[PDB]
Amino acid sequence: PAPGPDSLLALAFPSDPQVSPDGKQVAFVLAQIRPRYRSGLWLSEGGAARPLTHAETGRGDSAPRWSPDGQNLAFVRSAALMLLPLKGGEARRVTNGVSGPQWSPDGRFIAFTTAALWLYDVEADKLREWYAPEIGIGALSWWPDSRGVLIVQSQWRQDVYDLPLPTAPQKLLDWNSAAHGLAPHPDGQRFALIGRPAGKGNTEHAHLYLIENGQHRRLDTGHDHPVGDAVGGDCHVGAFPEGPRWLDGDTLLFSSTVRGSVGLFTAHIGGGVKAYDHDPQGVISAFTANEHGVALIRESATRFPEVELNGQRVTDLHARFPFPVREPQRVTFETELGEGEGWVLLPEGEQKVPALLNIHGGPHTDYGHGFTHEFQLMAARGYGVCYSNPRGSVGYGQAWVDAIYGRWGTVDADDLLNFFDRCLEAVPRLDAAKTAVMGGSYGGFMTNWITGHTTRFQAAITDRCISNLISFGGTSDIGLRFWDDELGLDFSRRADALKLWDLSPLQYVENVKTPTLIVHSVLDHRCPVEQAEQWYAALHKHQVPVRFVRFPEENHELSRSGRPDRRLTRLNEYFAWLERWL
Amino acid sequence: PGPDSLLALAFPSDPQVSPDGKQVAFVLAQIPRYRSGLWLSEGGAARPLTHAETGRGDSAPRWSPDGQNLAFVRSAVKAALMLLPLKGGEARRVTHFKNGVSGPQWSPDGRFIAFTTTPAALWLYDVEADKLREWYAPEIGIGALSWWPDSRGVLIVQSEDEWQASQWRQDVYDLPLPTAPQKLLDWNSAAHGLAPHPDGQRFALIGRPAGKGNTEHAHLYLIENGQHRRLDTGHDHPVGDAVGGDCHVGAFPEGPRWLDGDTLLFSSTVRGSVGLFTAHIGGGVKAYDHDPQGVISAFTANEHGVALIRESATRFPEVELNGQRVTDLHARFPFPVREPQRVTFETELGEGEGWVLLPEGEQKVPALLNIHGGPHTDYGHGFTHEFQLMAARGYGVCYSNPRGSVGYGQAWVDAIYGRWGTVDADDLLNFFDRCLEAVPRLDAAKTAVMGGSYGGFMTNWITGHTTRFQAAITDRCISNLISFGGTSDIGLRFWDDELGLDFSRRADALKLWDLSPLQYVENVKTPTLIVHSVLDHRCPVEQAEQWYAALHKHQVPVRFVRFPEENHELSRSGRPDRRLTRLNEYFAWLERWL
Amino acid sequence: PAPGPDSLLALAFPSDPQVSPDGKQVAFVLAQIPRYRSGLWLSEGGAARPLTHAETGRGDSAPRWSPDGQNLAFVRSAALMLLPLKGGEARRVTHFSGPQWSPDGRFIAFTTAALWLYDVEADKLREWYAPEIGIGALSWWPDSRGVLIVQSQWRQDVYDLPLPTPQKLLDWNSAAHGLAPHPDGQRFALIGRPAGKGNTEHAHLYLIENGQHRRLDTGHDHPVGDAVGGDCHVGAFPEGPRWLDGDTLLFSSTVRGSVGLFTAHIGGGVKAYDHDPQGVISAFTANEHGVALIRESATRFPEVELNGQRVTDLHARFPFPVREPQRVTFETELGEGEGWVLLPEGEQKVPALLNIHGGPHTDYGHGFTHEFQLMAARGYGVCYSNPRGSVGYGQAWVDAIYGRWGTVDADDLLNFFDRCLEAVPRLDAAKTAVMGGSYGGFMTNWITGHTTRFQAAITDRCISNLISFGGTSDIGLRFWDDELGLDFSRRADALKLWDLSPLQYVENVKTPTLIVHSVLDHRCPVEQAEQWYAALHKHQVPVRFVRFPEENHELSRSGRPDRRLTRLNEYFAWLERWL
């Protein structure tokens, strides 16, 4: 009997790999099993990790944070701040919930939000509200001197503030743009951030900037790739820290997405970027570091996420994967910007198998070397999965991103069908008569676009789709800016709205003949369900075979509450639709 | 210093020595509602190990043989088996039963944890495999249980069927580990405290042989090939703690333990004290730790160490490890304690004894005769918060061990057989007279009499046979011996054992009526406070309703306090309300009448 | 085919027959369906029709006509309601029992216990009097100036209570109820007994004037009120005497297992008004214009009547045929006693069940007993009698058992039973059982401890220890003083109570015994049954103890028939096991 969606319930999900201050231990979060996922803390001192807490109710424990002396672990329990002594005894609750705890480096305080910023005085065992922002607090880091914190706060434009310990926050940087990942320099005065300067739109690669007396200088020079993990994968449940960490006064360690992989690199104040730990066939999804050690989570297209400490794997999570994983093969396609790439994941055997073109979202993300249970399960059920990084994808340089600016549905659509044609030529086991196209978000937009511009696919599955760019501008919680950044078009202006209507898949819906599964959350704030309702009503009026699944659970329910119901049901509906149409 | 003083106290229990003999884990109940958590000492001041914020809390700490883990029972979750690694990390819940578990015991090899759960079945936790498995479903139920030292299985005490159970008679069985219990001893009598010998074949038990009535001192028996021979010979005192005191909250283990192949350590009640002694396979009983003015209420031991709880008439219970006190609980006692004075009385069996606890100062003070229950227990050297609080409020507390008490030999027990209300009442009033003579400060015109259970029977009896007391307080009383036989959960046997009388036989019923305080209630003139739980299964409230109704009809001043909480509410739920309210009513009644 | 206890659920139970002031209508209560709910029903002379409907709670009770005949006050669960009879739905006048209209229609008095007053014209409530001890009977003076109230060793007096802007009217110092103010506005009648009489004395009728009392039901050596057994009475059964004119007071009285209406005259003796010696009138109301009542027989289910015409169809609901009992006599030094045998169909031998009524000062006879009819429908011969101690055969018949329960009363029951076996050859002398409730349970315990002759016994709400009863019963303080002249709190008396205790003789019991008792019984505490059970179990007599969590009269209290159905099931299962 073939593996089904239930295979997911055998998996346990690691997150938040926190290296100890002395660099010799790693503490992390493991979520495991309507069945329901709960999270507990795990600890390794170099060997096989062991559970440290146990939760039988609620969402469980998260956010492990080492005290500077390495004798305690602060964590959040469901939400309350907990302190667990590592050498014996059970945790104590020291506090509508809490989040984002961070010890001061001197061990005297724990900062968290509850949202206002609050302060737990460790030696005095007292709480005090530190700062009640008017708009909200983004990134936060302690100065190495424990004098206070740096905070980010405000069209996605923010600045950086200095907030000393209480006895009012002063502005430290006129940034007026996107900023996160504050990494205070050891000297207590300079600091690094991740983002982009004021003049750049949000399709610009995020980069590393050194800040000094209000000036900025790019730190990850000569590296035409973004900071952070923007590679797809469906086995990340929980927090995935990627904050840059100064290894010495000259060396800032950070992660970066390059051609479907994510590696660690170092930027130097005195020069260029060096590889630190970058396998072009792997993804490092989270890391922590200090002067003594590094802990991270690693995965590949064939390897489930595992926790590592200083190069040694401390988890056994791939052994829980309930069926054999298969190795994809690479297939390239040509464009005026150079060679594009994608992959085909095949079932066992030698018979013809249906070909499923999967389109990643973003659009400025990458497919590639993340671990995708959904893809492995499709192959285990007899489908060939074809997935690629068209122009618009993020790991192939700024020009590859910029090629789709203002004209979604042109070169991106070409690249996807060019790739798919190359798959059929390169992989004779792919059945050219049993093809489907599918994707989520931008991938759903693209599924809607492609089926309205060709009838070649025998089935379509559109998830979290976009069909009407005009209505999206007014209903999405990012509608006010998303098209200005991605397309240079303002839906509230007449000439621009008409251009958005010409980029709308709904305009061409009269051409759709492909049986289509529509999957959407009723309460989606990013892609409102009105996008799916318009596509469904149009197909239904044309009597195109269509099925509309309306989830009452918002996206990412597994991370939000630990309930896998939405993901199991979604997979059931995907395969039921493919079994019905092939 | 009022009844509220109780809320300052924390109550220790279950002193469990580690296998290497160098640590003790125990239970501490503290504050409004008492919850219990586990505490640990390696020789110095004990430190908390768990913290209970909801429910009744944590209890039953059990060391894993390697000393690295503690199994325990948690209520927050009815009573779940928990496993706590001592070197770091939080406890793990190992059972998920609706009704919880009890009586966890590690096998000596550390491979299993045996426990019971709902009659409750015996279950097995496989430690290396992390699996649960039902071991044995008894027909009636399982009493004592111990592992063979080689961990091949357990010894269990149980009745064979409902016939034997209706006699309160049990045998001992061998129950090997599952891959069918065989009988090891045709006991057909009382047995508990199984102490398997290190040789893996013999074992000791506490109890009495079939031919002996239930008033015979519990003794120690060595079992070999179905044969029995008494082990604590030449020791005319019972095994176990039978001394009064009101600061025991939780489990108090007293299971005998082999210190070597010849030596079995046990506790025994002797003239109001409880001491440790050793029984020898090849010799007599020796004292091991016996202060004649102290009470050891619980202990554990192995070849490497001993842990216990110790107290006196002037010292609140403390936990010790190898002779060193590891708790500071007496320091929480909120007012100064005073020293009792001994006062004796004559009987044809020899001299009996009691004590007078006096308040500060030299003025005249009312005298309260307090009668212990049982009747086969002892007053003496346990710590009684109520007595110290009565003296702190200005009362002279007079309390004694009349014939019928348990610590003065079998003959002293037997003196009251079949004739409650004769020599026992004589001894109590003779003692009380000697108190008034020995201590001129006691006010002969402001006297009260009070007691619980048998003490309530005796309070009812005494007030119906003399008017001398100015006030009386009868708690959990007995007034009608006939109705008690049909209503009490032990009514079918208690009078048979204590008096040789069966209420269902006519000639015996009339004798039970002549031993009933209610028959003489027309003579009662003393203002009487009646205290009773509405749901008492042992002394049903009908016993108190009859006394109340009779007194009320004679228009004797009477007040009847009906608690909806059963007795021992502090132990059952941690709620001290019943104890505080009881003490409040006692003092209010004495303040009104003196 | 054989009917079981479930047959009970086919029945609807009438109560509280209230005649209209104009004498031409009756309003009454009907309890029907698993759970009984009650609603008000109305007849203007013909077949009664429903007037209220409630699908929650216990329903509606206490219908009271307004003096002008246009409204009906009633109690709904519990709150006072007013229903206009010629149209419109009821109104709730209280938002918080025993409502009584002033004769002039201006007020409604009720208790809530404190006495309260609803002003009809002002539509306001007001507390009238909050007694420290309690209020018993109550009636309005005919002038509506106020009410007479009874209130306090079970001794009471009568008070005068005028309308607010209480005085003592009679130093009675004894039992009084059924206040019936005379039309002249000064005299009043009561039911009870004078101070010098114990509670075993027949209740009688007394005319009160200026503190003096004179017996009104002279020459009638029988008690006022219905004291006949029957198990189809659910709800209130009014029996208050009513003046038909200034000389004539109408009342009911129990006579030899029947209950009839009679009239007492201020200037003469007692005359029959409506007395069939084979029927029972269980409740009535009357005025100068009409009479309404509920009537029954040993073969007729209770029905409501208005001025001699039956207005209900309730006997038609009885789901199996009823049978006619035959009378059997026995002789005593006080004269002839009587009882009855109810036989099943056919000609075959059948088991004989001796049933002992409670009280003990009540009567078996001509009430309707579903339990007895169902026992016969299931093949048992039911033998039931009125031994000395029973109430309908004169004061001497009552007084014969005083101070000595278990002597002549027990004699009469076994003498009666022996005469049944002689007179009724179909009764099987080898398959006999004895059973009863309350005093009848006392007597089942006593008899089985004094003879082995019965093959089965069923003791319900029993008494086994007269001493403990004295201290545990809510009437224990007085019951043995009244019934036996014995005080359990006195040493010499307690020994005599132990000699009257069935438990003293329990060693002789060999009869398999079913024990039925409520755990929360305040009248006969369950400790009485626990002692019998524990004693029989120790003697290894086959015994079964059914402990209900529902108190007695759960059907009346909540409308739930579960306790009666389960009880009947246990009775027949035990009889099936032993015969």
Which residue in B167, B482, B516, B543 has the most chain C C-beta atoms within 10 A of its own C-beta, making it the best mutation to test that interface? B482
Tokens representing residue B451 in the block:
């007691």
Q: How far is CA B576 from CA A315, B32, B529, in A?
A: 49, 8, 20
Q: Could you give the CA distance from residue C139 to residue A481 in angstroms, rounded to a whole number?
A: 85
Residue A570: phi and psi, rounded to 5, are: -60, -50
Using an 8 Å CB-CB cutoff, list chain A residues near B51.
Answer: 90, 92
Using alpha carbons, select from A51, A37, A29 the residue that is nearest to residue A8. A37
Q: How far is CA B541 from CA B157, B486, B487, B533, B537, in A?
A: 33, 13, 10, 7, 9
| End-to-end Cα distance, chain B | 19
> In Å, how far is B513's CA from the nearest CA of chain C?
9
Residue A377: phi and psi, rounded to 5, are: -75, -35
Quick check: helix, strand or coil at residue A477?
A: coil
For residue A44, how many other CB atoms are within 10 A of its CB? 23
> In Å, how far is B375's CA from the nearest CA of chain C?
24
Contact A87 B88 (CB under 8 A): yes
Quick check: helix, strand or coil at residue A340?
A: strand
DSSP A6: G
Nearest CB to B521; choose among C489, C503, C504: C489
- 3-state DSSP of A9-24: HHCCEEEEEEECCCCC
DSSP A169: P
> In Å, how far is C4's CA from the nearest CA of chain B?
34
Output the DSSP codes for C64-85: EE-TTSSEEEEEE--EEEEEET
Query: Angle at the Cα of A281 (from A279 to A285), degrees rounded to 5?
Result: 75
Asked if B519 has any chain C CB less than 8 Å from its own CB, the reply is: yes
Q: Could you give the CA distance from residue B248 to residue B274 in angstroms, rounded to a whole number?
A: 14
Tokens representing residue A357 in the block:
């073109």
Q: Could you give the CA distance from residue A455 to residue C232 in angstroms, rounded to a whole number?
A: 83
Asked if B547 has any chain C CB less than 8 Å from its own CB, the reply is: yes
Asked if B90 has any chain A CB less than 8 Å from its own CB, the reply is: yes
Asked if B76 has any chain A CB less than 8 Å from its own CB, the reply is: no
Contact B88 A91 (CB under 8 A): no
Tokens representing residue A283 in the block:
């993804």
For residue B357, how many other CB atoms are within 10 A of its CB? 24
What is the chain B residue with the closest CA to A88?
B88
Using an 8 Å CB-CB cutoff, list chain A residues near B88.
Answer: 52, 85-88
**Sequence-distant (≥ 6) Cβ neighbours of residue A459 within 8 angstroms:** A435, A436, A437, A514, A515, A516, A517, A577, A578, A581, A582
Instruction: Name the strands in the sheet holding A215-218, side by side, starting at the edge strand that comes first in the sequence.
Output: A179-184, A191-195, A207-212, A215-218
Tokens representing residue A402 in the block:
């910029």
Amino acid at C529: A
Instruction: Give me Rg for the CA atoms of chain B.
Output: 24
Q: Buried (b) or exposed (e) across B397-422, using 16+ Cβ within 10 A?
A: bbbbbbbbbbbbbeebbebbeeebbe
Half-sphere exposure at residue B53, Cβ-oriented, CA atoms within 13 angstroms: 5
> In Å, how far is B301's CA from the nearest CA of chain A?
25
Give the E-state strand segments of A322-421 in sequence order. Answer: 329-335, 338-345, 353-359, 384-388
CB C285 within 8 A of CB C278: no
Q: Please name the chains neighbouring B, where neighbouring means 3+ C-beta pairs under 8 angstroms.
A: A, C
Using alpha carbons, select from A192, A85, A211, A77 the residue that is nearest to residue A139. A192
Query: Angle at the Cα of C356 (from C350 to C360), degrees rounded to 5?
Result: 170
Tokens representing residue B580 in the block:
């505080």
Residue B466: phi and psi, rounded to 5, are: -155, 145
**Sequence-distant (≥ 6) Cβ neighbours of residue C423 within 8 angstroms:** C328, C341
The resolution, in angstroms to one decimal, equals 2.4
Q: How far is CA B94 from CA A92, B39, B53, in A?
A: 22, 21, 20
CB A78 within 8 A of CB A238: no
What is the chain C residue with the closest CA to B509?
C504
C556 noted as active-site residue: no
What is the chain C residue with the closest CA to B479?
C468
Domain containing A577 equals 329-581
Q: How far out from the chain centre does Cα A103 lie?
A: 26
Contact B486 C534 (CB under 8 A): yes
**Sequence-distant (≥ 6) Cβ neighbours of residue C109 within 8 angstroms:** C99, C100, C102, C115, C116, C117, C118, C128, C138, C140, C147
Nearest CB to C468; choose among B480, B502, B510: B480
Residues in chain B: 594
Asked if A90 has any chain B CB less than 8 Å from its own CB, the reply is: yes
Asked if B502 has any chain C CB less than 8 Å from its own CB, the reply is: yes
Q: How far is CA A71 from CA A20, A88, A89, C80, in A?
A: 10, 10, 12, 72
Output the DSSP codes for B252-278: -----EESSSSEEEEEEEETTEEEEEE
List % helix, strand, coil for chain C (3-state, nearest 5).
20, 35, 45
For residue A327, how many other CB atoms are within 10 A of its CB? 10
CB C397 within 8 A of CB C334: yes
Q: Could you give the CA distance from residue B160 to residue B173 in angstroms, rounded to a whole number?
A: 10
Q: Buried (b) or exposed (e) across B563-591, using 16+ Cβ within 10 A?
A: bebebebbbebbebebbbebbebbbebbe
CB C405 within 8 A of CB C417: no
DSSP H or E run through C472: helix C466-472
CB A196 within 8 A of CB A202: yes
DSSP H or E run through B156: strand B153-158
Tokens representing residue C163 in the block:
């309308």
> In Å, how far is C499's CA from the nearest CA of chain B?
10
Asked if A92 has any chain B CB less than 8 Å from its own CB, the reply is: yes
Peptide bond into B375 cis (omega under 30): yes
Asked if A93 has any chain B CB less than 8 Å from its own CB, the reply is: yes
Q: Could you give the CA distance from residue C454 to residue C541 in angstroms, rounded to a whole number?
A: 13
B376 noted as active-site residue: no
Q: Could you give the CA distance from residue C322 to residue C333 in angstroms, rounded to a whole number?
A: 35
What is the chain B residue with the closest CA to C507?
B505
CB A148 within 8 A of CB A138: no
DSSP H or E run through B399: strand B396-400
Which residue in B501, B504, B516, B535 has the most chain C C-beta atoms within 10 A of its own C-beta, making it the best mutation to test that interface? B504
Asked if B537 has any chain C CB less than 8 Å from its own CB, the reply is: no
Technique behind this structure?
A: X-ray
Asked if B572 has any chain A CB less than 8 Å from its own CB, the reply is: no
**Sequence-distant (≥ 6) Cβ neighbours of residue A300 within 8 angstroms:** A279, A281, A282, A283, A369, A371
**Sequence-distant (≥ 6) Cβ neighbours of residue B378 within 8 angstroms:** B242, B243, B244, B269, B271, B272, B372, B401, B405, B406, B407, B408
For chain A, count helices (H), then strands (E).
10, 36
Half-sphere exposure at residue C228, Cβ-oriented, CA atoms within 13 angstroms: 33
